[PDB]
């Protein structure tokens, strides 16, 4: 109903696209309180507040890779701050583990990750991006952060 497009592989929403198709109002308007999007085993993006999703192509607007996440990726298509998805967000990327310079495998021990201070490095470059660091999770490789706009 809502003109939302989401067809790319491993991508999902909360509420689900079939739940979002229930809360679309008779007019063809769809506003969601606390909307989450994501790509399985790679990450998620959460929009604290109310979000209008009407007539949006998510397969062009939102991309999640290994160790990369973003919204409105042609900056000529980027709407103003607070319009569409260009607003404050909690973002997680999963499987954020560093490479061992000698075994060439990803470092998946919490003890080893504490001993390199990986958490404080992820805080350091969250801050260089102007983002607010929230929590790292060594077990999943989840880096969690807030951002103001995209």
């Amino acid at each position: 109903p809502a003109g939302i497009i989401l067809t790319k592989v491993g991508y999902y929403t909360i509420p689900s696209m079939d739940d979002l198709a229930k809360i679309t109002n008779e007019k063809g308007e769809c506003i969601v309180s606390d909307f989450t999007i994501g790509r399985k085993g790679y990450g998620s993006i959460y929009f604290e507040g109310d979000v209008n999703l009407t007539n949006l192509n998510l397969d062009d607007i939102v991309h999640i890779r290994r160790k990369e996440v973003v919204v409105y990726l042609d900056d000529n298509q980027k709407p103003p701050v607070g319009e569409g998805l260009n607003r404050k967000a909690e973002v997680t990327l999963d499987g954020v583990w560093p490479t061992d310079k000698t075994s060439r495998c990803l470092i998946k021990s919490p003890d080893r990750l504490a001993d390199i201070n990986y958490e404080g490095r992820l805080e350091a470059v969250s801050r260089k991006q102007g983002a607010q660091f929230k929590e790292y999770r060594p077990e999943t490789g989840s880096w969690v952060f807030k951002v103001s706009h995209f």
Partner: protein, 148 residues
């Protein structure tokens, strides 16, 4: 690589990113790759070297001779590529790495890598430097052949 004969067009281009097979998307991940150290920061040439015979297929009788370009990332991963401006580009100039740094460090030998120097000696000595003021002295040696 740009020529002064053709100063606006690159005589050779080398992508350092493993991104083969996925085209047709834009441009904004440049924040998150940098935080993880996945940016190339510095490079240097070792001396002219004979290309290891396993990189070309089994049908060349001549020895091919190229410059070994050592490339440093901000995470302190080093990569190699062999470069000639004299030979056809057929499997010349593929990227090789990450290069394993012995012995295995538990701090990972830092994430603030910022300069690199490839000293003209045999075997090569590669100096890797960090913003903390650390300098690592890497002797470059050919890998092992694994017994079956």
């Amino acid at each position: 690589i740009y020529s002064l004969r053709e100063p606006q067009t690159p005589t050779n281009v080398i992508i350092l990113s493993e991104a083969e097979e996925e085209s047709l998307v834009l441009n904004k991940g440049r924040a998150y790759t940098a935080s993880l150290g996945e940016t190339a920061v510095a490079f240097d040439f070792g001396p002219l070297a004979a290309v290891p015979k396993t990189l070309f297929g089994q049908n060349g009788k001549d020895e091919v001779v190229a410059y070994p370009l050592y490339i440093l990332y901000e995470n302190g991963e080093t990569f190699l590529t062999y470069i000639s401006l004299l030979h056809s580009p057929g499997n010349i100039g593929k990227l090789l790495g990450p290069l394993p740094m012995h012995p295995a460090a538990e701090d990972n030998y830092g994430y603030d890598a910022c300069a690199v120097l490839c000293l003209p000696c045999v075997p090569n000595i590669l100096v890797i430097a960090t913003e903390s003021g650390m300098l690592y002295h890497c002797v470059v040696l050919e890998g092992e052949e694994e017994d079956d």
